[PDB]
Enzyme design. Structure first.
Site, PDB file in Angstrom:
ATOM      1  N   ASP D  43       0.842  -1.184   0.000  1.00  0.00           N
ATOM      2  CA  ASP D  43       0.000   0.000   0.000  1.00  0.00           C
ATOM      3  C   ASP D  43       0.887   1.247   0.000  1.00  0.00           C
ATOM      4  O   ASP D  43       2.096   1.181   0.232  1.00  0.00           O
ATOM      5  CB  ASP D  43      -0.949  -0.044   1.206  1.00  0.00           C
ATOM      6  CG  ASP D  43      -1.962   1.095   1.231  1.00  0.00           C
ATOM      7  OD1 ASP D  43      -1.655   2.218   0.786  1.00  0.00           O
ATOM      8  OD2 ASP D  43      -3.087   0.858   1.717  1.00  0.00           O
TER       9      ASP D  43
HETATM   10  C1  8Q1 Z   1       2.814  14.617  16.788  1.00  0.00           C
HETATM   11  C2  8Q1 Z   1       1.888  15.218  15.733  1.00  0.00           C
HETATM   12  C3  8Q1 Z   1       0.595  14.421  15.577  1.00  0.00           C
HETATM   13  C4  8Q1 Z   1      -0.187  14.843  14.337  1.00  0.00           C
HETATM   14  C5  8Q1 Z   1      -1.512  14.099  14.196  1.00  0.00           C
HETATM   15  C6  8Q1 Z   1      -2.239  14.467  12.905  1.00  0.00           C
HETATM   16  C7  8Q1 Z   1      -3.573  13.739  12.764  1.00  0.00           C
HETATM   17  C8  8Q1 Z   1      -3.405  12.226  12.661  1.00  0.00           C
HETATM   18  C9  8Q1 Z   1      -4.726  11.522  12.358  1.00  0.00           C
HETATM   19  C10 8Q1 Z   1      -5.150  11.685  10.901  1.00  0.00           C
HETATM   20  C11 8Q1 Z   1      -6.634  11.398  10.694  1.00  0.00           C
HETATM   21  C12 8Q1 Z   1      -6.927  10.842   9.302  1.00  0.00           C
HETATM   22  O1  8Q1 Z   1      -6.695   9.706   9.061  1.00  0.00           O
HETATM   23  S1  8Q1 Z   1      -7.631  11.909   8.015  1.00  0.00           S
HETATM   24  C13 8Q1 Z   1      -8.327  10.859   6.708  1.00  0.00           C
HETATM   25  C14 8Q1 Z   1      -8.224  11.573   5.364  1.00  0.00           C
HETATM   26  N1  8Q1 Z   1      -9.160  11.009   4.407  1.00  0.00           N
HETATM   27  C15 8Q1 Z   1      -8.873   9.733   3.776  1.00  0.00           C
HETATM   28  O2  8Q1 Z   1      -7.875   9.153   4.036  1.00  0.00           O
HETATM   29  C16 8Q1 Z   1      -9.850   9.138   2.764  1.00  0.00           C
HETATM   30  C17 8Q1 Z   1      -9.251   8.514   1.508  1.00  0.00           C
HETATM   31  N2  8Q1 Z   1      -7.874   8.133   1.767  1.00  0.00           N
HETATM   32  C18 8Q1 Z   1      -6.940   7.974   0.669  1.00  0.00           C
HETATM   33  O3  8Q1 Z   1      -7.301   8.162  -0.444  1.00  0.00           O
HETATM   34  C19 8Q1 Z   1      -5.490   7.577   0.946  1.00  0.00           C
HETATM   35  O4  8Q1 Z   1      -4.726   7.794  -0.204  1.00  0.00           O
HETATM   36  C20 8Q1 Z   1      -5.381   6.104   1.337  1.00  0.00           C
HETATM   37  C21 8Q1 Z   1      -6.486   5.294   0.661  1.00  0.00           C
HETATM   38  C22 8Q1 Z   1      -5.499   5.976   2.854  1.00  0.00           C
HETATM   39  C23 8Q1 Z   1      -4.027   5.563   0.884  1.00  0.00           C
HETATM   40  O5  8Q1 Z   1      -3.980   5.634  -0.512  1.00  0.00           O
HETATM   41  P1  8Q1 Z   1      -2.855   4.746  -1.326  1.00  0.00           P
HETATM   42  O6  8Q1 Z   1      -3.337   3.322  -1.452  1.00  0.00           O
HETATM   43  O7  8Q1 Z   1      -2.665   5.328  -2.706  1.00  0.00           O
HETATM   44  O8  8Q1 Z   1      -1.539   4.777  -0.587  1.00  0.00           O
END
Ligand code: 8Q1
Ligand code: CDL
Ligand code: CDL
Ligand code: PLX
Ligand code: PEE
Ligand code: PEE
Ligand code: PEE
Lengths: 459, 128, 103, 88, 603, 178
Positions: D43
């Site tokens: 992935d």
């Molecule tokens: C110390 C600092 C801490 C910071 C924390 C920041 C926040 C952390 C938590 C984040 C919350 C989330 O997940 S926010 C979630 C954002 N929305 C999505 O992920 C929906 C669709 N995802 C995709 O399309 C991606 O590409 C995917 C399929 C995953 C991979 O694709 P590949 O197959 O092409 O690799």
């Protein structure tokens, strides 16, 4: 004094009779010989003066200026050797003739026992400089610059002539010796106020004073290298020499007539030092630094104390040398870049290390690093102003800091960093440029060994 | 529920915190495409002028000359006397002068008065 | 996601050319052709040409030129304690007044 | 420094060494020309984790624009070699 | 006769021979660094003799050999002062410089311009000797500016890096802010005392006014990196490690404290300047220790440690103990220079890595540096019977038994505790845990230059404190009696700092994560001073430099008033005069009018 | 660096960039290896609970709130590699990079030394001299009307051709020239 004036005059027929490919060698060699001869005037005495004749006399204020003027010409010839290569023989001879005439006028001006002759030569210096600026100038603005460099000066000095003759109608003489021995106070009157203004504004404009300095960036940017040398080194000191000579009759009016000029200079030093911080042009930065230093010298002259005069003389000499060297370095960069912009050429210490060393030394000398004569004059004027008023130091201190800043800024933007990729016409520095840099910088470090030679008659 | 970041002039707002880098519209994408197109045109021109073996000089940048001319030689022709400009010029060119004149005049008046009345202890003040 | 075929081809060609150039940047065994032409002991000579001569010069300069003028070298007068004897005079300095010594 | 001049063979060996310690990839099936999501079925998050693992392995960090298109061990090796100017 | 003056001048002049030889053939070979190192060692050995003579007798001297110039009633001459401070600080500086040069011969082997680096180091050493041995204010200013210029040239050693140039300019700016006060002090002294000589200044000033001492304090704060003008010292670590170990740790930064020490006859006569110095030192040491406790770069932490020690010495000056401050200078030189040397060895062995997050188990992987840094940290924290105890312990006892500010005393105690705490932090994060560096292990200490250079400073930091303390005459009254708890206050607070720092650091092993608090953000960002003070003022100044001074005034109004108004008026008059249609009707109508007006007006 | 940029970044690229930044700042926060591994797996899991989100208007709100969270706990002093744009040795050796054309200004006495290198240098110069003339035509014929849209250059398509605008990429001075 004729033993130095006559060879300067004979420089002209020698140049005009020389071969088409040997004018530079003859001019440089004989100018250096004339400078060696003029070194004899440095043997001043604590007594009155070296009164050669009724027309010419030498003092320990005139002697260093004369030596600097004689020493400047070979440097200007070496600097101008490059950009006059494709010039016809007649026009090159005309350029050398203009330089020789300017030196002769300056030499006759710095002795000038009589004041009207001093004024006549003071204005005679205006013609060759104007011709040089307007004829052999690269850009289109030169003409306008020349106009400025003319009219300002004349606007300052046309009243002076009237004042001068008025004095001879009352005092009866304009000989500096008789003027000094028969000095009488100026009463507090409107007529005396306007006579003071007429006498002072003539030399204030060429120094220049803040607010009357608009001609100077134009004249220094638009002029060729030799013009910039002669304007920054010697032609700026004419105002200071004239003020130190003429303030002998303005007392005690100056004690309250110097307030506007002291305020203008003490604020204009800060204003121009801050202007230097944000400048897109090297020549303009050097010109504004010259304005700041000359404003400090104006403050020193207006204070009118022995330490003020000593510091003013030392600062004039040191500033002339330093500004000449800085203009030479800027011209050496420009002759390869052909742009005259600070940020176009960068990272030059990787390509020209010895030129980077020369830049560092020139910046340090401008930065007033002890025990240079620059800082000798700086400290003398600062202590004199502190005695005049304990608050002035604040402004002075600020200026010093700002000075260093822009100086190192000029050193850092042009020399340090990454080189410009698309500039591949940076040839190694010639022996001529390095010799010019050495001849600019070695006299400073040799004069710092014997400061009394440039400390003036009040040492 | 975290504390919010407040952008300032000297501490700007991060790109990832831009509320305009999400509400994306086809017009925004078209604008980005045109920006990339003109940037690529300029880059191609510079690279063509840069890799040429027959060039033995400096590649003149019209942007640099235009910037220098705008900063230096274009200020006056676009100058117009306006109340804002007039007041700012009068302030920045007159106020400091009179302020410093008043300060120095007051200091020197006090010094001269103390000289005249006589209690200042000027001992060893030889060189002036 | 990933390289396009044009990107792969250009990258491969550029790296081949870069490797050829970098290999060409090397030096042959005779590459720096130097043109020849001429026209305890180490510490022993160092201590003479870098220490002894400056000591001699400064001692001469201080003893015969600096001290030729008054007040050039001024020495803080030596400390004087009871019971001492001055070389110039020879008189003995009176001692203390036998203060009561107890612990 | 006294750092040895790492070569292409050393770079490839270290790349394969890092990849084999990643237990999500079969050690006996991985090859120098093996693709990530196709030959190994990985992935994108696993791809960036491999990128960061190599980043820590070699002491330098690859920009995202270049990291998001390094899909084979061979081209990762070639990218590192081009970055470090490796002759042979 | 009089070997004292001859030897004291000879060490300084033989420090100059390689500078002259820099134009010779040896400068173009690889023997130049060894040549300079041998010259420095020989100079130290030669200068060891005047120290012995002073220790035996108490010899003091001033040499006025060359007369520079006479300005009416003021004579300026090349005068050198050879008092206790000068003849004591020359050998320490020379020994430290010798150790640093021997370290540099190994650290900077890969630098193409290594001879230039060595000549720059020697030039800095010469300027510092000029500063220390100066007897008049002009020579002192010459040294003051020379050390600053050498620091500027050595910080920006790598000209390609923008951050190095920025740090060099920052250091120059802060040093010039100090130079303002220095010039104020010189001007006042010459205006009132009519001399820049120290002897006449001391004779003519029975009660020193506020202004010259305030100027001297401003200059000392500028160069010693006090809280007002501190950030330049932490920023000055962009340069090579030897530069930080020699210049910005132990030699150049103590120049302001040395300037305040040189004027101790005038400092004791003023009580407000002492209070200002005490407050400045206390705030400096507390703020720098609080910044250091939470940093991650080893060089930055050691720089903040140096700043805290400088603040403690300024506190000592403020409590009227100049000789004790000089003693602390002497011990701090040794152990802080050795600490920077150990940090540089770690960085070199670890492939140019400075952050401690990638430093793991080095207690066994590289033991000599570990034991050297442990000894140096123990000396720093004032462990009894080390080089730092014999100075810092007396500092604490003097500040506890003095009628001074109580807030400053509390700040000093907290600063000592925080010093112990970040020493614990360095040891724990650099030598105790599991390794965290890249797998390619290249740790190597087996070089005779590094080992010998570190071992000399080990011997120094172990025995020199005892030797100096027992071998100098007493210059202050002792605190013979002491409350039992007050006697141990420094030890108690240092041990408490060890315990609390270790307990708080051991919590990182736990498998728990939490976001940082406000205090951590405040302390990690250096108190927000570097941000605001480097963005709010400068921008505004720069903005004005283009808005009011350049464009509005110079390019618009000063151009409009004199030249443009004249041009406009003359053009309008020319247009009015020359706008004649050529009709003689109008000409002779005007002739009739003027003929009519003249008869009435002039008759 | 070596790759040309695009007009915009897709949601996938932004998600990957946020994930990498979060991992880097987490390892900056979690100094030790085991703690970092534990918390990195935990954060990958919490980042993985919304992989299969379908609607784009809800997946853009998740990353928008994730960028507000990362900023709050971003470790104001993160770890930076020494050669990175924020590292301590970023441009340390930038002043030792001397351009190749400088060798054209060497004195003949200096060019007497190293003869083979200079012979190879004229060989390379001639190769570039013909290659550039070929590449001008190739790039002029391959460019689309109205100018390029992205600054990506095509490779060489014939046998003896070389990639257009190759001289200043292959003639990089070195990583550590001195
Ligand atoms: C110390 C600092 C801490 C910071 C924390 C920041 C926040 C952390 C938590 C984040 C919350 C989330 O997940 S926010 C979630 C954002 N929305 C999505 O992920 C929906 C669709 N995802 C995709 O399309 C991606 O590409 C995917 C399929 C995953 C991979 O694709 P590949 O197959 O092409 O690799
Ligand atoms: C410390 C005293 C030393 C005395 C020994 C004798 C030294 C004689 C020097 C005379 C003047 C030098 C000539 C200037 C241009 C240099 C020519 C050149 O091209 O260099 C290449 C040449 C060969 O190198 P290269 O590899 O071929 O060239 C590659 C590049 O050039 C790359 O070049 P680079 O990277 O190697 O850098 C060039 C170098 C050289 O360039 C310079 O900048 C040198 C000039 C520095 C002065 C800056 C102006 C400020 C005003 C000071 C005025 C002092 C003059 C005093 C009288 C001098 C008489 C002429 O720059 C520096 O080293 C930095 C200088 C900053 C020093 C700041 C401290 C100044 C005050 C110190 C105290 C002075 C008074 C002492 C009074 C009390 C004690 C008795 O190198 C040198 O020759 C260097 C010379 C040594 C440096 C001198 C610096 C301090 C000495 C100042 C004068 C001595 C005072 C007298 C007291 C003696 C006791
Ligand atoms: C007379 C009897 C004698 C006996 C007296 C009693 C004996 C001692 C009693 C104990 C007293 C306190 C001991 C606790 C020490 C603190 C340790 C701690 O909890 O830190 C963790 C905790 C934060 O930890 P974290 O953020 O979760 O950790 C981040 C990660 O773990 C990442 O962490 P990392 O791995 O990167 O590094 C961890 C590092 C990073 O940790 C930090 O974040 C640094 C902050 C802690 C430094 C505070 C220590 C001293 C504070 C002095 C403040 C002076 C005044 C400041 C003025 C502020 C103006 C608003 O922490 C450390 O390395 C160790 C911290 C320092 C401990 C060693 C020295 C302290 C012991 C000695 C203190 C006093 C005894 C002296 C004896 C004198 C005789 C009386 O720090 C705090 O919560 C702060 C507590 C104290 C702050 C005081 C300042 C508050 C000011 C706020 C405003 C107030 C109103 C003002 C209004 C003004 C209007 C104009
Ligand atoms: C622009 C770049 C710089 C160029 C030069 C600028 C400096 C020029 C200023 C010249 C010196 C000041 C001018 C007048 C000085 C007289 C003293 C006056 O300032 O003091 C008061 C005088 O008050 C008023 O100034 C009186 C005159 C008021 C009318 C003059 C116009 C003032 C503003 C004009 C500004 C225009 C500047 C540009 C001119 C082209 C005290 O009054 P009083 O003690 O009882 O009388 C003093 C004179 N006595 C003793 C001989 C009797
Ligand atoms: C090495 C070369 C010498 C070889 C052997 C000779 C050894 C010395 C014997 C020479 C004769 C003695 C001699 O040098 O003469 C002294 C002679 C001058 O004679 P005086 O008239 O007494 O002094 C001037 C005031 N009237 O002194 C000298 O010039 C040489 C020593 C000068 C000191 C060194 C100066 C270095 C610093 C340069 C100036 C820096 C700025 C000024 C300092 C600022 C301080 C406020
Ligand atoms: C009472 C009367 C007092 C008269 C004072 C005379 C001042 C001396 C300068 C006179 C110049 C006036 C003419 C003028 O400027 O024309 C505008 C002119 C139009 O351009 P032209 O070259 O003529 O034509 C090209 C396009 N076809 O504009 C310019 O170019 C101006 C450029 C030159 C600037 C000169 C600046 C002179 C003013 C500086 C101070 C001197 C003031 C003297 C009096 C001071 C007051 C006491
Ligand atoms: C760059 C621009 C600078 C332009 C020059 C600025 C200075 C101008 C100063 C005035 C110039 C002429 C002054 C007269 C020369 C001195 C002669 C003198 O003092 O004699 C006075 C004569 O005094 C005058 O006539 C002065 C009248 C002024 C006429 C010209 C006015 C010019 C503009 C005045 C305002 C400018 C002042 C400030 C200028 C600031 C700089 C721009 C006494 O005459 P008597 O009849 O013999 O004695 C009376 C008792 N029986």
């Amino acid at each position: 004094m004729l033993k130095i004036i006559i060879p300067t005059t004979m420089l002209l027929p020698m140049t005009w009779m020389s071969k088409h490919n040997m004018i530079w060698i003859n001019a440089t060699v004989h100018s250096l010989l004339i400078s060696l001869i003029s070194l004899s005037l440095l043997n001043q005495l604590g007594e009155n003066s070296l009164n050669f004749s009724l027309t010419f006399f030498s003092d320990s204020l005139s002697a260093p200026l004369l030596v600097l003027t004689t020493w400047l010409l070979p440097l200007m010839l070496m600097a101008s050797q490059s950009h006059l290569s494709k010039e016809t023989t007649t026009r090159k001879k005309l350029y050398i003739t203009m330089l020789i005439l300017l030196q002769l006028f300056l030499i006759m001006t710095f002795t000038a026992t009589e004041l009207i002759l001093f004024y006549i030569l003071f204005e005679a210096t205006l013609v060759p400089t104007l011709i040089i600026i307007t004829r052999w100038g690269n850009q289109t603005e030169r003409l306008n610059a020349g106009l400025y460099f003319l009219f300002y000066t004349l606007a300052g000095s046309l009243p002076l002539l009237v004042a001068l003759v008025y004095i001879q109608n009352t005092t009866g003489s304009l000989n500096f010796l008789i003027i000094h021995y028969w000095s009488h106070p100026l009463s507090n009157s409107w007529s005396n106020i306007f006579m003071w203004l007429a006498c002072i504004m003539a030399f204030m404009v060429k120094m220049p004073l803040y607010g009357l300095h608009l001609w100077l960036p134009k004249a220094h940017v638009e002029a060729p290298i030799a013009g910039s040398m002669v304007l920054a080194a010697v032609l700026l000191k004419l105002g200071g020499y004239g003020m130190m000579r003429i303030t002998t009759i303005l007392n005690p009016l100056t004690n309250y007539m110097a307030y506007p000029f002291l305020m203008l200079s003490m604020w204009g030093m800060i204003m121009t030092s801050s202007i230097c911080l944000r400048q897109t042009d090297l020549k303009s930065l050097i010109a504004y630094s010259s304005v700041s230093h000359m404003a400090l010298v104006i403050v020193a002259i207006m204070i009118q104390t022995p330490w003020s005069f000593m510091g003013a003389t030392a600062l004039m000499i040191a500033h002339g040398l330093t500004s000449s060297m800085l203009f030479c370095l800027a011209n050496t960069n420009y002759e390869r870049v052909h742009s005259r912009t600070m940020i176009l050429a960068r990272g030059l210490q990787t390509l020209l290390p010895l030129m980077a060393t020369w830049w560092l030394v020139a910046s340090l000398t401008n930065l007033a690093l002890p025990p240079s004569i620059n800082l000798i004059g700086e400290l003398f004027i600062i202590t004199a102003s502190f005695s005049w008023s304990n608050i002035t130091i604040i402004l002075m201190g600020m200026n010093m800091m700002i000075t260093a800043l822009y100086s190192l800024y000029m050193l850092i933007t042009t020399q340090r960093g990454k080189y410009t990729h698309h500039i591949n016409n940076i040839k190694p520095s010639f022996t001529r440029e390095n010799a010019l840099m050495a001849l600019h910088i070695l006299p400073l470090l040799l004069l710092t060994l014997n400061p009394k030679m440039i400390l003036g008659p009040l040492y | 529920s975290f504390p919010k970041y407040k952008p300032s002039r000297l501490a700007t707002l991060p790109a990832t915190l831009d509320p305009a880098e999400y509400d994306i519209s086809p017009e925004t994408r078209k604008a980005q495409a045109e920006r990339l197109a003109i940037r690529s045109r300029l880059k191609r021109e510079y690279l063509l002028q840069y890799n040429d073996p027959n060039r033995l000089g400096v590649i003149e940048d019209p942007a640099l000359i235009r910037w220098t001319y705008a900063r230096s030689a274009n200020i006056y022709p676009n100058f117009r006397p306006t109340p804002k400009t007039s007041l700012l010029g009068a302030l920045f060119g007159i106020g400091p002068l009179f302020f410093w004149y008043y300060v120095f005049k007051t200091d020197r008046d006090k010094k001269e008065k103390l000289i005249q009345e006589g209690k200042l202890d000027q001992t060893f003040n030889i060189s002036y | 996601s990933g390289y396009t075929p044009d990107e792969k081809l250009r990258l491969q060609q550029l790296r081949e050319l870069r490797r050829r150039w970098l290999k060409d940047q090397e030096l042959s065994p005779r590459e720096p052709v130097l043109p020849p032409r001429r026209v305890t002991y180490r510490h022993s000579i160092f201590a003479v040409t870098h220490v002894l001569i400056p000591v001699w010069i400064i001692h001469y300069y201080l003893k015969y030129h600096v001290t030729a003028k008054p007040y050039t070298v001024v020495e803080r007068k030596p400390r004087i304690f009871p019971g001492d004897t001055i070389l110039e005079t020879g008189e003995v300095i009176p001692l203390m007044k036998e203060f009561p010594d107890q612990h | 420094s006294d750092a040895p001049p790492l070569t292409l063979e050393a770079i490839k060996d270290r790349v394969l060494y890092v990849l084999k310690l990643y237990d999500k990839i079969d050690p006996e099936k991985l090859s120098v020309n093996s693709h990530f999501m196709k030959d190994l079925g990985l992935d994108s998050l696993d791809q960036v984790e491999i990128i960061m693992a190599m980043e820590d392995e070699f002491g330098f960090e690859i920009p995202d624009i270049d990291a998001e298109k390094l899909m084979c061990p061979q081209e990762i090796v070639d990218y590192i070699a081009d970055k470090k100017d490796v002759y042979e | 006769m009089n070997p004292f003056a001859s030897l004291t001048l000879t060490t300084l002049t033989i420090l100059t021979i390689p500078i002259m030889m820099s134009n010779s053939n040896i400068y173009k070979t690889n023997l130049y660094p060894n040549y300079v190192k041998t010259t420095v060692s020989y100079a130290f050995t030669l200068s060891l003799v005047p120290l012995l003579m002073f220790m035996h007798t108490g010899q003091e001297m001033i040499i006025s050999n060359w007369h520079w110039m006479t300005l009416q009633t003021v004579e300026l001459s090349l005068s050198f002062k050879m008092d206790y401070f000068s003849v004591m600080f020359i050998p320490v500086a020379l020994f430290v410089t010798w150790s640093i040069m021997e370290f540099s011969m190994w650290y900077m082997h890969s630098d193409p311009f290594i001879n230039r680096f060595f000549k720059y180091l020697l030039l800095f050493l010469i300027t510092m000797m000029i500063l220390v041995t100066a007897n008049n204010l002009f020579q002192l200013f010459i040294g003051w500016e020379g050390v600053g210029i050498m620091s500027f040239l050595l910080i920006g050693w790598w000209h390609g890096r923008t951050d190095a140039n920025t740090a060099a300019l920052q250091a120059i700016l802060y040093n010039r802010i100090g130079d303002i006060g220095f010039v104020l002090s010189m001007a006042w002294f010459l205006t009132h005392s009519n001399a820049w000589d120290l002897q006449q200044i001391f004779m003519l000033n029975n009660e020193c006014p506020n202004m010259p001492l305030i100027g001297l304090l401003l200059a000392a704060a500028g160069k010693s990196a006090q809280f007002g003008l501190h950030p330049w010292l932490p920023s000055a670590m962009e340069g090579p490690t030897p530069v930080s170990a020699l210049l910005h740790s132990s030699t150049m930064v103590v120049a302001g404290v040395f300037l305040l020490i040189r004027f101790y006859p005038l400092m004791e006569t003023n009580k407000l300047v002492q209070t200002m110095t005490l407050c400045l030192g206390a705030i400096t040491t507390l703020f720098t220790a609080l910044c250091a406790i939470t940093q991650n770069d080893i060089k930055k932490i050691v720089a903040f440690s140096t700043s805290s020690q400088l603040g403690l010495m300024m506190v000592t000056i403020g409590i009227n103990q100049p000789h004790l401050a000089f003693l602390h200078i002497c011990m701090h030189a040794f152990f802080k220079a050795m600490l920077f040397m150990c940090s540089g060895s770690i960085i070199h062995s670890l492939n140019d890595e400075q952050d401690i997050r990638k430093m793991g188990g080095l207690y066994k992987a590289m033991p000599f540096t570990t034991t050297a840094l442990i000894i140096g940290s123990l000396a720093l924290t004032g462990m009894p019977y080390l080089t730092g105890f014999y100075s810092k312990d007396l500092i604490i006892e003097a500040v506890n038994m003095s009628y001074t500010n109580a807030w400053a005393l509390l700040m000093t105690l907290i600063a000592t505790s925080l010093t112990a705490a970040y020493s614990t932090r360095i040891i724990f994060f650099a030598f105790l845990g599991k390794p965290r560096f890249p797998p390619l292990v290249l740790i190597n200490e087996n070089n005779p230059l590094l080992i010998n250079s570190i071992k000399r400073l080990l011997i120094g930091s172990i025995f020199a404190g005892f030797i100096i303390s027992n071998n100098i005459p007493p210059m202050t009254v002792p605190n013979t009696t002491m409350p039992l708890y007050m006697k141990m206050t420094a030890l108690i607070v240092t041990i408490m700092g060890f315990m609390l720092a270790l307990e708080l650091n051991n919590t990182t092993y736990y498998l728990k994560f939490k976001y940082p608090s406000q205090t951590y953000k405040f302390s990690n960002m250096l108190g927000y001073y570097p941000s605001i003070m480097h963005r709010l003022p400068t921008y505004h100044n720069l903005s004005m430099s283009q808005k009011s001074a350049s464009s509005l005034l110079d390019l618009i109004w000063l151009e409009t008033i004199l030249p443009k108004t004249t041009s406009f008026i003359q053009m309008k008059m020319s247009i009015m005069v020359s706008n004649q249609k050529g009709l003689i009707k109008l000409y002779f109508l005007s002739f009739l009018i003027t003929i009519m007006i003249s008869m009435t007006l002039f008759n | 660096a070596f790759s040309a940029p695009a007009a915009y970044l897709t949601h996938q690229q932004k998600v990957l960039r946020l994930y990498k930044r979060a991992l880097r700042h987490l390892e900056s926060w979690c100094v030790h290896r085991d703690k970092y591994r534990y918390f990195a797996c935990l954060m990958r899991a919490r980042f993985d609970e919304h992989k299969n989100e379908k609607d784009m208007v809800k997946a853009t709100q998740l990353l928008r709130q994730a960028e507000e969270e990362f900023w709050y706990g971003q470790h104001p002093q993160p770890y930076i590699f020494p050669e990175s744009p924020g590292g301590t040795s970023y441009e340390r050796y930038e002043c030792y990079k001397v351009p190749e054309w400088c060798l054209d200004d060497w004195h003949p006495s200096e060019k007497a030394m190293y003869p083979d290198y200079f012979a190879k240098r004229e060989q390379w110069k001639r190769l570039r001299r013909e290659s550039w003339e070929r590449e001008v035509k190739q790039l002029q014929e391959e460019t689309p009307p109205g100018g390029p849209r992205t600054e990506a250059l095509p490779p060489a398509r014939k046998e003896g051709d070389l990639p257009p605008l190759w001289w200043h990429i292959v003639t990089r001075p070195r990583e550590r020239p001195m």
